[PDB]
């Protein structure tokens, strides 16, 4: 009775009307939860997308609209019940043709060769929760990634107030008619196809290395196979990375996450720490692809180490908050060429300049990890090592301060102003920020940062905590020194 | 996997109101069917527990339902439908207090003990169907079994006039509503009390044996480990029983209906065991005019084992639900049926549980052997030695649909043959011996020998039982005189 009552508590749980935290909370993620909690029932997905093929047509989508799932549980009912309200409202909508799993990245490029050929722009709906076992369900508009805070703003709006109504606004068809309306669409054939200018597949097949790709059970088994038996990928499909460690008998492994927009890399001397491999990632792009004046995208709580990659090879870098929604613009216009977080997420442009995929792409991460190999005669771990020693080596940590339901408020409210110390575990302060350096947006909480070391502090937007995150360049017993400081501090502005 | 996909439609897919094949099929079996072919779905489920709500005052149903459902996926959502409409009818619905799953005899025990003590009777809705692929519903009266032809009739009209009328009168509350009003109700407790007034748990506790039990995944899990909890039985809970570092292993299917028995020497054949429980019964029981009963496809090793003893035979067409007016009221104290499925008497003659009980019969494998000093294999070959060794065979011939309904029409005057397989034709019947209702089908019966052909329910298929104590080669010939006689009858 897990997986059952799970499905049937989809249909059978709805939200209560009175508790706004039950209600759809569609935030940078799309909006999550569990039918287990009545967060995400039948009533959230009927509502979201009844909301979507309204403003739809004010977001600026007319064309088709890229339906797509993970392997998650829920994501099944999901996909019904939205595929039969869209259909329902007259849109186009296309789903996959092979298998009936679509990762996060297939969208998104999806969506972006049909807009860059079309005039009634498309746009796409993701049925994924990201992971533990809930559901999800994301929007990414014409941009092909996931959608601004104006956008889901709107949503969330009318979908609580369909809710409130009782869903009597809704329209929705019988999935056996919708079912027949959809159309099917060869994800990975595109994928396949277009990739290849974004990564050097011939430098890889012709490698002579022995790369392993483990879907992990995530939505990215078939495209994986296809790019091995098109393009005659030394590569293994053998079904983050969590325990792909199992057999580091490979050059090097793949692993992706369900709906595959994260990545995991695993050599024969382990699983890599995310940081570590953006960090190397970062300097074999940077190294090898000529993108006139494009930035290094990162958030502000992703590794100072890519900060250093980006300065001794001459490129910017630009800050934002989370949120890998605060770099789609950037790639869509291509003065990002890199955009990645700390949460093992990240994309990059196609040779051209042009973007490849504007959301997070694990696929795409995965094949650059073979083709760093392929063309750099070393693995990633070993090029992250030689970055750490000529650039410095980034020692990170993070840990959660229970507070109390008043203090988690006063904490929202706290600025740069209120928190100025001198100094950071021996250093001289060189910044306080309240604001993203890169766009000036508010970031939610601060970040205060050293020559060698730095840390933030944000509001959980779920539960009565203080999220502090830390870095530091000067070793384990230094980055304690700054959490102390970093967790003292927060008490003094919370008290 | 294909499971999310098994409930979703469950819930997204509708039957064809143009189409009586995807309509409500209460049979004896009660309404089965899959939502991977819109046969078993929300509307199926929503339409026949409105029905049942509406019906039982009719049917002398004024006390409690019991509510039960199997490890079957589509069961859990089918429960949810099932409690939500039986809510709102105010309809005191007792569930499972103990685990999720509850075996359809449990719940046969707690209907009939709740009618033993009370005015107001109560009944009883399982939901459970067959492969993993589908689910059923099927409803229980104040008789504790299998409920007769009238009321399932009745449940099937007014189910499919709700369907037909897009299920307009269907009322219900919200899951989490009736889940509040929900009675929890400790099945198992009931059974493991109980269950000593039908078999002598003392002797197995002292057998020095050691037995097996493999709920196979099933519902029946926790009533048997609180059985050898509650009792010191000898019992280890762990078909593919097949793996006898035991005296004597059981299996149950998903509802706990069947049983299915297992000794060093294999898994016994059901008929077989049927045939030893039935002589170690009655050679131990003291069931002053209790009646033998069986269905007419069911191994006739049983009645010359019952003729061995004395005792009367009760012959019925194929379904449980024939036996349980007599085991509800006394006159026969064993009621059998070749698909693994049986029941008996308490020692004093009382019901113990008017619907197939697999741990029953189970627990009574293990008595059989510790009582008697021999395996129920080993009875069952002294049996066969001393009053003949049966040889069964089943068979199934697709038939045109036309066939199919020529078949349907069939009688005991198109199958009239004087000999089979070189013996005298003793008689042939398209009618049960016991009561008197007609067998669907006709059944041909020799003095070492008899076939029985009848239309399958589901498919245009016609179905041949033969069985003959004189052999294989015998037995082949019983087959093939029935095959070539069915196929002359349906030209």
């Given at each position: 009775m897990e997986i059952t009552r799970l499905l049937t508590l989809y249909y059978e749980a709805t939200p209560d009307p009175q508790n706004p935290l039950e209600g759809v909370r569609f935030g940078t993620s799309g909006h999550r939860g569990s039918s287990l909690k009545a967060t995400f029932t039948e009533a959230h997905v009927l509502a979201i997308a009844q909301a979507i093929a309204e403003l739809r047509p004010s977001f600026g989508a007319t064309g088709p609209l890229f339906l797509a799932k993970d392997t998650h549980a829920l994501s099944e009912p999901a996909w019904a019940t939205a595929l039969s309200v869209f259909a329902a409202h007259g849109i186009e909508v296309r789903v996959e043709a092979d298998g009936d799993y679509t990762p996060t990245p297939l969208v998104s490029l999806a969506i972006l060769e049909h807009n860059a050929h079309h005039e009634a722009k498309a746009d796409g709906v993701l049925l994924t929760?990201?992971?533990?076992?809930d559901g999800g369900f994301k929007y990414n508009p014409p941009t092909g990634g996931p959608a601004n805070a104006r956008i889901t703003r709107a949503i969330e709006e009318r979908a609580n107030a369909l809710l409130q109504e009782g869903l009597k606004g809704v329209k929705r068809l019988p999935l056996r008619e919708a079912l027949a309306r959809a159309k099917p669409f060869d994800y990975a054939g595109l994928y396949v196809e277009k990739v290849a200018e974004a990564v050097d597949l011939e430098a890889i097949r012709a490698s002579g290395l022995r790369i392993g790709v483990d879907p992990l059970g995530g939505a990215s088994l078939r495209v994986w196979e296809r790019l091995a038996e098109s393009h005659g990928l030394p590569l293994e499909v053998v079904n983050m990375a969590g325990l792909?460690?199992?057999?580091?008998?490979?050059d090097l492994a793949i692993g992706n996450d369900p709906d595959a927009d994260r990545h995991g890399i695993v050599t024969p001397r382990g699983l890599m720490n995310p940081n570590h491999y953006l960090a190397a990632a970062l300097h074999h792009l940077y190294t090898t692809r000529?993108?006139?004046?494009a930035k290094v995208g990162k958030t502000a709580?992703?590794?100072?180490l890519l900060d250093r990659v980006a300065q001794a090879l001459g490129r910017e870098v630009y800050e934002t908050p989370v949120?890998?929604?605060?770099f789609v613009a950037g790639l869509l216009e291509g003065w990002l060429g890199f955009a990645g977080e700390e949460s093992a997420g990240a994309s990059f442009l196609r040779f051209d300049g042009r973007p490849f995929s504007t959301d997070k792409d694990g696929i795409l991460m995965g094949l650059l990890a073979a083709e760093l190999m392929a063309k750099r005669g070393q693995a990633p771990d070993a090029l992250y090592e030689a970055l750490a020693e000529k650039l410095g080596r980034p020692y990170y940590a993070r840990k959660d301060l229970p507070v109390s339901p008043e203090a988690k408020a006063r904490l929202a409210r706290l600025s740069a102003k209120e928190v100025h110390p001198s100094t950071l575990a021996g250093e001289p302060v060189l910044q306080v920020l309240d604001?993203?350096?890169?766009?000036?947006?508010?970031?939610g909480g601060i970040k205060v940062v050293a020559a060698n070391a730095w840390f933030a502090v944000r509001p959980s937007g779920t539960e009565d905590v203080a999220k502090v995150y830390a870095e530091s360049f000067l070793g384990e017993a230094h980055l304690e020194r700054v959490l102390e400081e970093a967790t003292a501090l927060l008490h003094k502005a919370l008290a």
């Open positions: 929760p990201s992971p533990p076992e792909l460690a199992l057999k580091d008998r490979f000529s993108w006139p004046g709580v992703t590794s100072a949120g890998f929604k605060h604001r993203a350096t890169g766009n000036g947006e508010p970031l």
